[PDB]
C-alpha cells in the first residue's frame, strides 16, 4: 500500500524484548492475560500485589507454578518473581529469595504483614538487600492527603528516595513507572555507580497526558497510578525513553481489571496494555522519530540491569493497521484494553 510522502521504516526488527513491570493477576484473569504478554515478551517482572500479597519466597514459588501452568504449550516465557515488602519482612526472606533463583526484586508500595507503614521499619532487611544484590523496586509516591495527587511523585523524591539512596548507597533501586520530568531528571542525572539505579516507563505515560482522563467525559480505562501528568511531563518522558540512556527501560505496568470494576462509582486504577504493549511503544517511538532507540529500551537495558542475558531471538513489528477488540474475556468476564475499539498502526508479526 503506497505510503504518503510524509509517511521512517515499514518494519522494525529487534531482539526479543522483556516487560520489567507487569501485573499478571491470578486464576481466570491470569489465564486470559498471560498469553498476551508471552507473545510479546521473553521475560517479565511479575509484581506481587495479589490479594493476599506475595510476601514470602514460598508464596512466590507457588505463584510461579500457577503462571507456568497457564502458559500455553507453544509459548516461551519466564516469570521473574517478586516479593511485596512489608514492615515485617525479615532479612532471612531476602536471603532465601536470592538463593531461590526465581525472585528478582522486592517491591515497595506506598501504604504490617501486608505492607510498609514506615520504611524505617525495614532497615535490617534493606541492609540484607544491599548485601545480597536484591534490587528494591519502588512505587515512588507519598500518600500524604495534604499533597496534591500530581505532586506526590516529586515529593517522594525528596522525602523518601533521596534518604533511601543516601542510607543504602550500595542498594540497587528501580524507580518504577516514572511519570514526571522531576523523576526523569532525577534518574538521568543521579550520581550512581553502574547498575545501581534504573527506571521503568509505561507505554500509556508516553502516549497520553492527563487530558485523556477527561476527553468528552471521565475515562476510567485511562486511570492508573501514578496518574497521567501534564503534557510538559509527558514530553520529558518521551525524551528520556528515546535517549539511549541505559537507566531507562520498558515496563508496561499492564494492570487489568474486569470492566465492571472500572465502570463503577469508585473505579480501580490500572490500564490494560499487555494485548498490544509493543505496538503502543512503537507508536510512541515512531512519533518521536526514534524507532532506532526501541531496541535498547525494550530489549537491552532492563536485562543488563537485572544481570540477565540479552535475547538471541529476533521479533518484528509491522506497520499494518488493526482494529483492537473492545473487550477481551477472562472466562465470561470482559476486560477492556486501553484504546479497545480503536484502530492502531502497528502489529507484532
The binding site for Zn(2+) consists of 21, 23, 107, 139, 177, 253
State phi, psi for 49 to the nearest 5 degrees.
-85, 50
Residue 118 to residues 52, 55, 129, 253: CA-CA distances in angstroms? 20, 17, 17, 24
Nearest residue (CB) to Zn ion, 200 versus 242: 200
Cell, residue 303 = 536485562
Cell, residue 243 = 535517549
Residue number, nearest CB to Ca ion: 230
Binding mask 244-263 for Zn ion (x = CB under 5 A): ---------x----------
Determine the interface stretch with Ca ion among 109-117, 139-147, 158-166, 230-238 (rule: CB under 5 A).
230-238
Q: How far is the CB of 44 from Zn ion (least distance, A)?
A: 12
The enclosing H or E element of 317 equals: strand 314-318
Nearest residue (CB) to Ca ion, 10 versus 149: 149
Asked if residue 135 lies in contact with residue 172, where contact means CB atoms within 8 angstroms, the answer is yes
Q: How far is the CB of 223 from Ca ion (least distance, A)?
A: 17
| Neighbouring C-beta atoms of residue 250, cutoff 10 Å | 26
Q: Does 204 bind Zn ion (CB under 5 A)?
A: no
Residue of 87, 16, 17 lying closest to 252 (CA atoms): 17
Asked if residue 13 lies in contact with residue 314, where contact means CB atoms within 8 angstroms, the answer is yes
- 26 in active site: no
Interacting partner of 232 out of Zn ion, Ca ion, none (Cβ under 5 to 8 A depending on kind): Ca ion
Catalytic residue among 253, 260, 286, 304: 253
> Is the link from the previous residue into 11 a cis peptide, with omega within 30 of 0?
no
Q: How far is the CB of 254 from Zn ion (least distance, A)?
A: 9
Strands 314-318 and 11-15, by their bridges, are: antiparallel
> Is the link from the previous residue into 226 a cis peptide, with omega within 30 of 0?
yes
Write out the binding residues for substrate.
23-25, 49, 139, 225, 257, 269
Q: Does 283 bind Zn ion (CB under 5 A)?
A: no
Q: Between residue 95 and residue 124, which ones bind Ca ion under the rule CB under 5 A?
A: none
Distance of CA 320 to the CA centre of its chain: 26
Query: Residue 15 forms beta bridges with which residues?
Result: 314
If DSSP codes are grouped into helix, strand and coil, which group holds residue 50?
coil
Determine the interface stretch with Zn ion among 35-43, 78-86, 139-147, 278-286 (rule: CB under 5 A).
139-147
Nearest residue (CB) to Zn ion, 177 versus 276: 177
Interacting partner of 139 out of Zn ion, Ca ion, none (Cβ under 5 to 8 A depending on kind): Zn ion
Q: How far is the CB of 247 from Zn ion (least distance, A)?
A: 18
Burial classification of residue 35, based on how many CB atoms lie within 10 Å of its CB (0-12 exposed, 13-18 middle, 19 or more buried): middle
Q: Which of 232, 264, 314, 316 binds Ca ion (CB under 5 A)?
A: 232
Nearest residue (CB) to Ca ion, 10 versus 215: 215
Q: Does 139 bind Zn ion (CB under 5 A)?
A: yes
Write out the binding residues.
21, 23-25, 49, 107, 139, 177, 225, 253, 257, 269
* Cβ within 8 Å of residue 65, ≥6 positions away: none
Residues at the contact surface with Ca ion, assessed by CB under 5 A: 230-232
Residues at the contact surface with Zn ion, assessed by CB under 5 A: 139, 253
Which residues are designated catalytic?
253
Amino acid at each position: 500500500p503506497p505510503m504518503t510522502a510524509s509517511n521512517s521504516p515499514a518494519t522494525l526488527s529487534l531482539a526479543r524484548p522483556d516487560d520489567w513491570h507487569l501485573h499478571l493477576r491470578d486464576g481466570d484473569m491470569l489465564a486470559a492475560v498471560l498469553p498476551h504478554t508471552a507473545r510479546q515478551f521473553g521475560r517479565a517482572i511479575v509484581m506481587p500485589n495479589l490479594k493476599p500479597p506475595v510476601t514470602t519466597t514460598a508464596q512466590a514459588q507457588a505463584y510461579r507454578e500457577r503462571i507456568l501452568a497457564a502458559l500455553p504449550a507453544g509459548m516461551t516465557f519466564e516469570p521473574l518473581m517478586t516479593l511485596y515488602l512489608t514492615d515485617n519482612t525479615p532479612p532471612d526472606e531476602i536471603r532465601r529469595a536470592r538463593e531461590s533463583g526465581f525472585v528478582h526484586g522486592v517491591k515497595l508500595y506506598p501504604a504490617s504483614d501486608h505492607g510498609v507503614t514506615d520504611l524505617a521499619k525495614c532497615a535490617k532487611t534493606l541492609e540484607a538487600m544491599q548485601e545480597t544484590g536484591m534490587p528494591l523496586l519502588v512505587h515512588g509516591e507519598v500518600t500524604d492527603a495534604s499533597i496534591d495527587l500530581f505532586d506526590r511523585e516529586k515529593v517522594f523524591i525528596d522525602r523518601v528516595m533521596t534518604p533511601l539512596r543516601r542510607d543504602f548507597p550500595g542498594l540497587k533501586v528501580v524507580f518504577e513507572h516514572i511519570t514526571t520530568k522531576d523523576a526523569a531528571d532525577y534518574v538521568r542525572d543521579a550520581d550512581a555507580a553502574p547498575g545501581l539505579l534504573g527506571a521503568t516507563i509505561t507505554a500509556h505515560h508516553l502516549l497520553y497526558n492527563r487530558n485523556a482522563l477527561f476527553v468528552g467525559g471521565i475515562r476510567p480505562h485511562y486511570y492508573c497510578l501514578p496518574v497521567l501528568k501534564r503534557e510538559t511531563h509527558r514530553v520529558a518522558l518521551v525524551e528520556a525513553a528515546t535517549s539511549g540512556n541505559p537507566r531507562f527501560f520498558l515496563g508496561t505496568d499492564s494492570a487489568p481489571h474486569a470492566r465492571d470494576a472500572k465502570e463503577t462509582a469508585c473505579g480501580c486504577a490500572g490500564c490494560y496494555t499487555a494485548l498490544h504493549a509493543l505496538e503502543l511503544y512503537a507508536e510512541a517511538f515512531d512519533t518521536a522519530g526514534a524507532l532506532d532507540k526501541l531496541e535498547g529500551f525494550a530489549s537491552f537495558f532492563g536485562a543488563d540491569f537485572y544481570g540477565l542475558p540479552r535475547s538471541a531471538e529476533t521479533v518484528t513489528l509491522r506497520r499494518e493497521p488493526w482494529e483492537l477488540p473492545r473487550e477481551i474475556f477472562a472466562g465470561e468476564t470482559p476486560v477492556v484494553p486501553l484504546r479497545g475499539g480503536e484502530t492502531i498502526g502497528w502489529k507484532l508479526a
